[PDB]
Amino acid sequence: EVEIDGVLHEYSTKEGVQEDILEILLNLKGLAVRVQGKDEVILTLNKSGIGP
DNA sequence: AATCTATCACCGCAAGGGATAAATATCTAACACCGTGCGTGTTGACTATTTTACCTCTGGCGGTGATAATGGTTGCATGTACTAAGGAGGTTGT
Protein backbone atom coordinates (compact mmCIF):
# COMPACT_ATOMS: atom_id res chain seq x y z
CA GLU A 1 0.00 0.00 0.00
CA VAL A 2 1.22 3.67 -0.59
CA GLU A 3 0.33 7.28 0.55
CA ILE A 4 1.60 10.17 -1.69
CA ASP A 5 1.82 14.05 -1.40
CA GLY A 6 -0.43 14.61 -4.50
CA VAL A 7 -2.15 11.32 -5.62
CA LEU A 8 -5.45 11.98 -3.74
CA HIS A 9 -6.84 10.42 -6.98
CA GLU A 10 -5.04 8.97 -10.08
CA TYR A 11 -6.48 11.70 -12.40
CA SER A 12 -4.15 14.33 -10.74
CA THR A 13 -1.02 16.38 -11.68
CA LYS A 14 2.21 17.91 -10.19
CA GLU A 15 3.88 20.63 -12.39
CA GLY A 16 7.61 19.84 -11.68
CA VAL A 17 7.42 15.99 -11.96
CA GLN A 18 7.88 14.37 -15.49
CA GLU A 19 5.43 11.46 -14.95
CA ASP A 20 3.02 14.39 -14.15
CA ILE A 21 1.65 11.93 -11.54
CA LEU A 22 0.07 8.91 -13.31
CA GLU A 23 3.35 7.42 -14.75
CA ILE A 24 4.63 7.09 -11.10
CA LEU A 25 2.32 3.96 -11.07
CA LEU A 26 5.21 2.00 -12.65
CA ASN A 27 7.54 0.68 -9.86
CA LEU A 28 5.14 0.40 -6.86
CA LYS A 29 3.99 -2.95 -7.47
CA GLY A 30 7.65 -3.22 -8.61
CA LEU A 31 9.99 -2.33 -5.72
CA ALA A 32 10.83 -5.42 -3.59
CA VAL A 33 13.17 -6.00 -0.58
CA ARG A 34 13.92 -8.47 2.28
CA VAL A 35 12.85 -7.98 5.98
CA GLN A 36 14.15 -9.57 9.27
CA GLY A 37 10.83 -9.53 11.11
CA LYS A 38 7.00 -9.39 11.37
CA ASP A 39 4.55 -9.01 8.42
CA GLU A 40 4.08 -5.22 8.36
CA VAL A 41 6.84 -2.62 7.77
CA ILE A 42 7.07 0.95 6.44
CA LEU A 43 9.29 3.25 4.33
CA THR A 44 9.08 6.85 3.13
CA LEU A 45 10.48 8.28 -0.15
CA ASN A 46 11.29 11.95 -0.01
CA LYS A 47 13.13 13.36 -3.13
CA SER A 48 13.86 17.12 -3.08
CA GLY A 49 15.28 19.23 -5.96
CA ILE A 50 16.15 18.12 -9.56
CA GLY A 51 16.77 14.37 -10.21
CA PRO A 52 15.42 10.80 -10.43
C1' DA B 1 38.27 -5.19 -4.93
C1' DA B 2 37.71 -4.58 -0.50
C1' DT B 3 33.99 -4.04 3.62
C1' DC B 4 29.78 -6.32 6.18
C1' DT B 5 24.86 -7.01 8.23
C1' DA B 6 21.21 -9.33 8.06
C1' DT B 7 19.05 -12.61 4.87
C1' DC B 8 17.15 -17.42 3.98
C1' DA B 9 18.51 -20.78 5.88
C1' DC B 10 23.37 -24.95 6.54
C1' DC B 11 25.28 -26.06 9.70
C1' DG B 12 25.42 -26.88 14.81
C1' DC B 13 26.41 -31.10 16.42
C1' DA B 14 21.86 -34.61 18.95
C1' DA B 15 20.06 -38.57 17.60
C1' DG B 16 19.38 -43.16 15.26
C1' DG B 17 18.95 -45.94 11.19
C1' DG B 18 21.22 -49.44 7.79
C1' DA B 19 24.81 -51.69 7.04
C1' DT B 20 28.27 -55.15 6.39
C1' DA B 21 31.25 -58.20 8.17
C1' DA B 22 32.28 -61.33 11.49
C1' DA B 23 31.25 -66.16 12.80
C1' DT B 24 28.77 -69.75 12.11
C1' DA B 25 26.52 -73.26 9.33
C1' DT B 26 24.79 -74.70 5.49
C1' DC B 27 25.13 -75.58 0.62
C1' DT B 28 27.50 -77.39 -3.72
C1' DA B 29 31.11 -78.55 -6.56
C1' DA B 30 35.62 -80.36 -7.71
C1' DC B 31 37.84 -84.06 -7.72
C1' DA B 32 39.74 -88.93 -7.35
C1' DC B 33 38.60 -92.92 -7.49
C1' DC B 34 36.32 -96.80 -10.04
C1' DG B 35 33.90 -99.07 -13.96
C1' DT B 36 32.19 -99.17 -18.34
C1' DG B 37 32.43 -99.41 -23.28
C1' DC B 38 34.12 -97.47 -27.15
C1' DG B 39 36.75 -96.34 -31.30
C1' DT B 40 43.04 -98.33 -28.74
C1' DG B 41 45.73 -101.57 -32.31
C1' DT B 42 46.90 -105.20 -36.06
C1' DT B 43 45.47 -108.65 -38.62
C1' DG B 44 42.59 -110.94 -41.90
C1' DA B 45 38.66 -111.95 -45.13
C1' DC B 46 35.54 -109.80 -47.11
C1' DT B 47 33.17 -107.31 -51.23
C1' DA B 48 32.59 -104.32 -54.18
C1' DT B 49 37.08 -98.02 -53.58
C1' DT B 50 38.94 -97.49 -57.88
C1' DT B 51 40.89 -98.46 -62.31
C1' DT B 52 40.77 -100.65 -67.04
C1' DA B 53 38.77 -103.72 -69.96
C1' DC B 54 34.89 -105.43 -72.35
C1' DC B 55 29.86 -105.83 -73.84
C1' DT B 56 26.32 -103.54 -74.97
C1' DC B 57 22.70 -98.44 -71.39
C1' DT B 58 21.20 -93.57 -72.19
C1' DG B 59 20.61 -89.96 -74.71
C1' DG B 60 23.27 -87.17 -78.17
C1' DC B 61 20.69 -84.92 -82.67
C1' DG B 62 19.91 -85.45 -87.27
C1' DG B 63 16.61 -86.20 -90.23
C1' DT B 64 12.09 -85.23 -92.38
C1' DG B 65 6.44 -88.03 -92.99
C1' DA B 66 2.03 -87.93 -98.44
C1' DT B 67 -5.91 -90.93 -99.98
C1' DA B 68 -5.77 -85.51 -99.32
C1' DA B 69 -5.74 -81.11 -96.96
C1' DT B 70 -3.98 -74.68 -101.91
C1' DG B 71 -8.65 -66.26 -100.40
C1' DG B 72 -6.00 -65.41 -94.55
C1' DT B 73 -6.79 -63.25 -90.12
C1' DT B 74 -7.07 -59.33 -86.67
C1' DG B 75 -9.96 -56.40 -83.19
C1' DC B 76 -10.03 -52.15 -80.82
C1' DA B 77 -4.31 -46.85 -81.07
C1' DT B 78 -8.90 -43.13 -80.22
C1' DG B 79 -12.95 -40.22 -79.07
C1' DT B 80 -10.29 -34.81 -75.25
C1' DA B 81 -7.44 -29.91 -75.70
C1' DC B 82 -4.75 -27.63 -77.50
C1' DT B 83 -2.44 -25.84 -82.17
C1' DA B 84 1.72 -25.98 -85.39
C1' DA B 85 2.86 -27.85 -89.61
C1' DG B 86 2.32 -29.87 -94.25
C1' DG B 87 -0.66 -30.79 -97.51
C1' DA B 88 -4.22 -29.88 -101.33
C1' DG B 89 -6.00 -26.80 -105.66
C1' DG B 90 -8.54 -23.23 -107.65
C1' DT B 91 -7.93 -18.55 -108.26
C1' DT B 92 -7.48 -13.54 -107.79
C1' DG B 93 -4.14 -11.63 -107.54
C1' DT B 94 1.94 -10.73 -106.91
Method: cryo-EM
Q: Is the CB of A35 under 7 A from strand B?
A: yes
Q: Is the CB of A9 under 7 A from strand B?
A: no
| 3-state class (DSSP) for residue A39 | coil
DSSP string, A11-24: S---BTBSSTTGGG
Interior angle at CA A47, CA A43 and CA A6, nearest 5: 80
Distance, Å, A51 CA → B78 C1': 94
Q: Is the CB of A47 under 7 A from strand B?
A: no
| Amino acid in the structure at residue A31 | L
Resolution to 1 decimal, in Å?
A: 17.0
- Kindly report the bases of strand B lying within 7 A of a protein C-beta atom: 6-8
Spatial distance between the Cα atoms of A41 and A19, rounded to a whole number of angstroms: 27
